[PDB]
Design a protein around this ligand. Structure first.
Ligand SMILES: [Zn+2]
Ligand SMILES: [Zn+2]
Ligand SMILES: [Zn+2]
Ligand SMILES: [Zn+2]
Length: 314
């Protein structure tokens, strides 16, 4: 009998445009079909009587900005999610920032923050307890970024210095500085977590340790190299791992961004899960899950491209 049950989905990236491809032309992007997959996920979550949904970001594509349709695209996906009739928690990813400024995002339906939060500090991160002995933490992986901060701000300048110290492709910072190894991550479509944000995460986890809570952490960007392609990792992913490895309360770290997905268990026992992306899923397939938190284990039931997973608690 589960303590708590929630839906999970990543990288819907809806747009009312014809199918496209990724840069390397190795994956197709099913922009319109994403809304059909989202509608079906919602139907399934309704049957399951889920208590909330967490969506891992890139809910609408940056192409919407280029066709001046950002608001109508967001309306479309919000209408599908509203049909579920439960709280939806929204992680902000790179495509959110391509479409909207932070003040716009804060005033929008994508602000699910309303535990503790960092909104007053201009960081979109928050934590709450959905059920006894469990805690959810949503992180802002574009806290340090050039795409999610205002030109001339302290944080944008800091982020630009970090990015361009590692990536000399000033003419197109979406191109990685190398083709092999972890330095690929230093691209404009990624970001990192500020010292302020990490100090807060570390504090949340210390308190969770002492309360014997199990903590689930959600981020648009993955942080463990075993769980995602290096080009998809947070800029300071190792700083995050160092925090997680310090705390037995960490149950799992769940991310989107790498549409291929990935998963692994850290040497600490913490599970990293990178959800397969809806946008690169064809209509004959699927990509979403429902997670069940029991007193002794978490079971994730995946559909289509997402495989099931069970985490037995330490
Ligand atoms: Zn994406
Ligand atoms: Zn820094
Ligand atoms: Zn550096
Ligand atoms: Zn992304």
């Amino acid at each position: 009998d589960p303590v708590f049950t929630f839906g999970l989905i990543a990288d819907v990236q809806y747009a009312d445009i014809e199918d496209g491809e990724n840069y390397l032309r190795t994956r197709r992007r099913y922009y319109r079909g994403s809304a059909d997959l989202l509608r079906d996920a919602v139907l399934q979550w309704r049957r399951e009587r889920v208590q909330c949904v967490v969506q891992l970001g890139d809910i609408i594509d940056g192409h919407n900005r280029r066709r001046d349709a950002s608001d109508r695209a967001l309306d479309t996906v919000m209408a599908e999610l509203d049909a579920c009739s439960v709280d939806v928690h929204h992680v902000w990813g790179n495509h959110e920032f391509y479409n909207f400024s932070r003040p716009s995002l804060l005033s929008s339906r994508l602000n699910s923050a309303q535990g503790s939060d960092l909104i007053g500090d201009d960081i979109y991160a928050y934590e709450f307890s959905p059920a006894p002995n469990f805690r959810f933490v949503l992180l802002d992986a574009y806290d340090l970024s050039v795409i999610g901060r205002e030109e001339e701000s302290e944080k944008h300048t800091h982020s630009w210095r970090i990015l361009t110290q590692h990536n000399h492709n000033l003419q197109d910072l979406n191109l990685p500085p190398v083709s092999v190894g972890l330095e690929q991550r230093f691209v404009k479509f990624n970001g990192g977590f500020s010292e302020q944000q990490l100090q807060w995460l570390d504090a949340v986890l210390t308190l969770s340790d002492h309360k014997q809570e199990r903590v689930l952490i959600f981020s648009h960007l993955p942080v463990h190299p075993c769980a995602a392609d290096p080009i998809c990792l947070a800029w300071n992913h190792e700083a995050v791992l160092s925090v997680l490895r310090s705390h037995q309360s960490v149950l799992c770290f769940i991310a989107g961004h790498d549409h291929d997905g990935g998963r692994c268990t850290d040497s600490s026992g913490a599970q990293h899960i990178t959800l397969e992306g809806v946008i690169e899923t064809p209509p004959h397939s699927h990509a979403f899950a429902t997670a069940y938190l029991y007193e002794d284990r978490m079971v994730m039931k995946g559909r289509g491209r997402v495989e099931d997973l069970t985490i037995t608690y330490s």
